[PDB]
């Protein structure tokens, strides 16, 4: 059964991006997915996304801008401290010039640069570059 809604959504986005589609539909929506997509949209890797609201869990239609390479997930949400965030960063990112790691922190869902900026750790969510 589906146990990682964020993982399913991220895999769907990655496959649609690889196939070159202009829009992608991810069926199970959640607050975590919306926050992840908001982070990606603020960093410009995706376009606008619109939430179709049924009385069940909603759906999301994302406009793909074509500038995404990978948007994978780290399924076991490991506890990430600021002392090992660098090791996570150079394990998951293509380079130190670009690429972001989204981790859920006590201050909210945000990328690793903002996490280090406001000096907090959290649980790993995923990455995109």
């Amino acid at each position: 059964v589906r146990m990682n809604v964020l993982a399913d959504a991220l895999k769907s986005i990655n496959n649609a991006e690889k196939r070159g589609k202009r829009q992608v539909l991810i069926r199970p929506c959640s607050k975590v997915i919306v926050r992840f997509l908001t982070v990606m949209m603020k960093h410009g890797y995706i376009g606008e996304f619109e939430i179709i609201d049924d009385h069940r869990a909603g759906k999301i239609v994302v406009n793909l801008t074509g500038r995404l390479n990978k948007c994978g997930v780290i399924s076991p949400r490991f506890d990430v401290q600021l002392k090992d965030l660098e090791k996570w960063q150079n394990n998951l990112l293509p380079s130190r010039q670009f690429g972001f790691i989204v981790l859920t922190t006590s201050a909210g869902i945000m990328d690793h640069e903002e996490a280090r900026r406001k000096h907090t750790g959290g649980k790993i969510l995923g990455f995109f570059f």
Binding site: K21, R22, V24
Partner: protein, 83 residues
Amino acid sequence: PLAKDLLHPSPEEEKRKHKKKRLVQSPNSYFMDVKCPGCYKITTVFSHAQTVVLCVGCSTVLCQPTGGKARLTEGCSFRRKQH
């Protein structure tokens, strides 16, 4: 087609798609007013009724349950409820 508009599908494909696989779920069934000849009252019947609907003022059957849709008895009239 890489640029299909998923946000705004036209009603033709919106109807041909499966009920669950639509953008928003919509049942394919409905409710109908049924008139039995020789009777005055109006019976509200589910289109996919699983039971034999009977009139209370006449010992007559209105629909027979089938696999997908209740088959109305001949001579009976019917109209939709609010599309």
